[PDB]
Design a protein around this ligand. Sequence first.
Ligand code: MG
Length: 478
Amino acid sequence: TSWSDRLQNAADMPANMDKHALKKYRREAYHRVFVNRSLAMEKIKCFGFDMDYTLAVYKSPEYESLGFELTVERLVSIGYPQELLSFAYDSTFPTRGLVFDTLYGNLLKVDAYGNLLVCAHGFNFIRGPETREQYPNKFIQRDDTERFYILNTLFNLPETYLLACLVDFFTNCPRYTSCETGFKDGDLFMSYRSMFQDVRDAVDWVHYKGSLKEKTVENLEKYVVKDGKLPLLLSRMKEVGKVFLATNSDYKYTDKIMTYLFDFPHGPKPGSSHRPWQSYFDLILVDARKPLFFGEGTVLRQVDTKTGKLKIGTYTGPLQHGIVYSGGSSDTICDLLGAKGKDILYIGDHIFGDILKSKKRQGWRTFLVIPELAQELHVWTDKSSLFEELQSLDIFLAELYKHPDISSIQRRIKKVTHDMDMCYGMMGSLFRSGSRQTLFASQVMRYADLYAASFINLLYYPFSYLFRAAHVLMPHES
Ligand SMILES: [Mg+2]
């Protein structure tokens, strides 16, 4: 079972809008909206959406597998060895949010401070003291964006696995000789960083010049989750506020995916006339180029929807029914919809490009969609046992220190941590390794005001609702 399977099964279920059923439904964890900072939904005037992996959740592992095989084939066609074609995507290896160290070829799972939680060279997990050879302080400066690349979105799941496949392949192929920073084959030296760059470029190419979009659009049922409750939520949002779309995808792909997402024999609810997807939005903006969108942006353009090409020139006119925008900036949204940042709930899946930047740069309210959360929640409850253990041991270890045994328990902690981590996958949970929270976890807590397995979970809350977080206290305040 994949995380998308739980999403698809919830998506099959029609909306019972009886108010008692909604409170019952919302209190199950899979359907709940989780709260880091308090948000009074009554003060929200604009609900804004990203598309890919927010409204349009690609099915797993089919979509990653397609992206993987198309990327491998691109690498082979530019000259990588034919043995790459025998690679097959394996969904149990990659966890999202890993850091690839382009200097030493390692995949790293780090905490908010750059401390190493897991280090994997190819498929060989480097433990404790062996990592100190390359990481003397067991720590990396993630600010060093020239050396480290954070694989932050679900689109990066294929290359996460692919990078490990390649490091493993070149390490164990006898034509190549291993060095600290790459592989030599006679007079050709392939550094990990140039290998990383080829992988990044092939992923980009597959998405923007190869066949990924075509193959997706010609079998949408295979690749994209569909949910009849989407038009209902959006029309309800439209009753109390304005609704807008702001996506990095271009108009043609956006049109094809959104038409699929609303392709039901009805509109908001069964029985209602079907309406075009564009009628659910007061503002539609494509080619957003987030996160730049939340700073200077680019020039505001108008899409020719008959052709899907941009009209020549900068659009200077008013908000007008039927118009589709391209580029612009977050200020375009604020001016045209007459909103301030704290009037806006922006909903998306990119912790950096959608959530961190809109929060920090513009003061928008934020809702982070985490598709994996459905499966993470399944594992976290089912295996609460080892976590409570882990909490007990650290507490007991402290009392030992102030009073063998300590060395025995440090090893017992390490064994439990590993046992807990292996139940999510080889790279462990999205949110932690044992008792240590991941960088991704800390960034969710810091910048996502709300978060959920799906944006659809908002349907189960009235729009007067005050999402309440606990007041935070410093250690001395208790
Ligand atoms: Mg997205």
